[PDB]
Design an enzyme around this catalytic site. Structure first.
Site, PDB file in Angstrom:
ATOM      1  N   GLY A  46       0.822  -1.268  -0.191  1.00 44.93           N
ATOM      2  CA  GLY A  46      -0.212  -0.360   0.286  1.00 44.93           C
ATOM      3  C   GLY A  46       0.919   1.090   0.265  1.00 44.93           C
ATOM      4  O   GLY A  46       2.134   1.089  -0.242  1.00 44.93           O
ATOM      5  N   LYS A  66       0.695  -6.637   8.164  1.00 40.03           N
ATOM      6  CA  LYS A  66       0.935  -5.035   7.384  1.00 40.03           C
ATOM      7  C   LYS A  66       2.294  -5.003   8.482  1.00 40.03           C
ATOM      8  O   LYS A  66       1.960  -4.303   9.605  1.00 40.03           O
ATOM      9  CB  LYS A  66      -0.222  -4.716   7.789  1.00 40.03           C
ATOM     10  N   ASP A 154     -11.799   5.710   5.154  1.00 38.06           N
ATOM     11  CA  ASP A 154     -10.841   4.810   3.442  1.00 38.06           C
ATOM     12  C   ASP A 154     -12.297   4.284   3.580  1.00 38.06           C
ATOM     13  O   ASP A 154     -11.826   3.440   3.205  1.00 38.06           O
ATOM     14  CB  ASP A 154      -9.756   5.118   4.132  1.00 38.06           C
TER      15      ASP A 154
END
Length: 327
Positions: A46, A66, A154
Site C-alpha cells: 500500500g 502488515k 477510507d
C-alpha cells in the site's frame, strides 16, 4: 471564514473518555513475539505498508501481517490505538498481535485472516439479497466505530473483506481512521478519489462520521447500478464535476453557501450547470434486478452533498431496504 459544523450523533463521545482513549501519542505499544510468525506470501503493498499472508506457527492459524512504513509517523500509534479501541466490535478486523519486524525494524501489525475474493470478481456475482445483506454488515461496523468516536475515512471495496463462502465480512485498514472531536479541523487529503465525499472535494475540514456514509453510498451505487466506479473522475476536480452531473449544481451551490464555503476558482471553467438527475437514469436491463424503490430511496439518502443531511449508520439500518434481510 467557513461556518462550523458538528456531528449530529455521537457528538461528544470522546470528551467523556479518559484522555488515554483518544490521546494516542501517549499510548505504549505492547509487543508480542515476532518468532511466532512465518511470512508465506506477499499480498500487496500500500502507500503505507507491505501486507503479507502469514502463519502463526504456534497454533498454525493463518494471519495477515502488515509491516508499517516510516510514513509521517504518529500514524503508527493512531492506527494501533484505534484498532485496540475497536477490537471485538461487530465486523471490525481483529488485531491479533503487534511485533517488531527484524528486517524493517518497524512495527508489524498482525490481523486475523479473512478469505476474500477480489471485489472486481465478487460484485459481479452478488444478488440483490446479498447486496442488502452485506451492506447491513458494513453498517454494523460503521455504527460501532462511530459510537466509539472514530471515523474510518477510507471506506471502499478494497477495505471490505468478504469470505463469501461463509457470509463473513470485516472492515479493514484503519490506518486513515481518526478520532472525532467536535470543532476539530481534519486533513481533506484522505480516502480514495472515487469515494471522497464532497466535503473533501470542496476543502471543508470540519467533517465527521458522515464522511463514511457518503463513501458507503458511492459503493452502493456502484453495486446496484453495476458501474465501477460510479463517480469516475480523472482527478479530484473532475471528481466533483462527475458528482455534480448526477446530484446537480444547484444543490452543490446550496451546500457550499450553507457552510459559507467558496469553490476553488478553477471550477469556474469546468463545473457548468447541471440538473439533478432522477436515479432511474442509471437503471437498465443489466442492473434492473438489483434495483428497487427501496434501494433507490436508501441511496438517495446517503448521497447528499450536505454531510449533515445524510443518514447516520443507525438511521441507515432502520431503512426499508433492509426489511427483507433476516435478522
Amino acid at each position: 471564514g467557513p461556518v462550523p459544523s458538528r456531528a449530529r450523533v455521537y457528538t461528544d463521545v470522546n470528551t467523556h473518555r479518559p484522555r488515554e482513549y483518544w490521546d494516542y501519542e501517549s499510548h505504549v505499544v505492547e509487543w508480542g513475539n515476532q518468532d511466532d510468525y512465518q511470512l508465506v506470501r506477499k499480498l500487496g503493498r500500500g502507500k503505507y505498508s507491505e501486507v503479507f499472508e502469514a502463519i502463526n506457527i504456534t497454533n498454525n492459524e493463518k494471519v495477515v501481517v502488515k509491516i508499517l512504513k516510516p510514513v509521517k509517523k504518529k500514524k503508527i500509534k493512531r492506527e494501533i490505538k484505534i484498532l485496540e479501541n475497536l477490537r471485538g466490535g461487530p465486523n471490525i478486523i481483529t488485531l491479533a498481535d503487534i511485533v517488531k519486524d527484524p528486517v524493517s525494524r518497524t512495527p508489524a501489525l498482525v490481523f486475523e485472516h479473512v478469505n476474500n475474493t477480489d471485489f472486481k470478481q465478487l460484485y459481479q456475482t452478488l444478488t440483490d439479497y446479498d447486496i442488502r445483506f452485506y451492506m447491513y454488515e458494513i453498517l454494523k461496523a460503521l455504527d460501532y466505530a462511530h459510537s466509539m468516536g472514530i471515523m474510518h475515512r477510507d471506506v471502499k471495496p478494497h477495505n471490505v473483506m468478504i469470505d463469501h463462502e461463509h457470509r463473513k465480512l470485516r472492515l479493514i485498514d484503519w490506518g486513515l481512521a481518526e478520532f472525532y472531536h467536535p470543532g476539530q479541523e481534519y486533513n481533506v487529503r484522505v480516502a480514495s478519489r472515487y469515494f471522497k465525499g464532497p466535503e473533501l472535494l470542496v476543502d471543508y475540514q470540519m467533517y465527521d462520521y458522515s464522511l463514511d456514509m457518503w463513501s458507503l453510498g458511492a459503493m452502493l451505487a456502484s453495486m446496484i447500478f453495476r458501474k465501477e466506479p460510479f463517480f469516475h473522475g480523472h482527478d479530484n476536480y473532475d471528481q466533483l464535476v462527475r458528482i455534480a452531473k448526477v446530484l446537480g449544481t444547484e444543490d452543490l451551490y446550496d451546500y457550499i453557501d450553507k457552510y459559507n464555503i467558496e469553490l476553488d476558482p478553477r471550477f469556474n471553467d469546468i463545473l457548468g450547470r447541471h440538473s439533478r438527475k432522477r436515479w432511474e437514469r442509471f437503471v437498465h436491463s443489466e442492473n434492473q434486478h438489483l434495483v428497487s424503490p427501496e434501494a433507490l430511496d436508501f441511496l438517495d439518502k446517503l448521497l447528499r452533498y450536505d454531510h449533515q443531511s445524510r443518514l447516520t449508520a443507525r438511521e441507515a439500518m432502520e431503512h426499508p431496504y433492509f426489511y427483507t434481510v433476516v435478522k
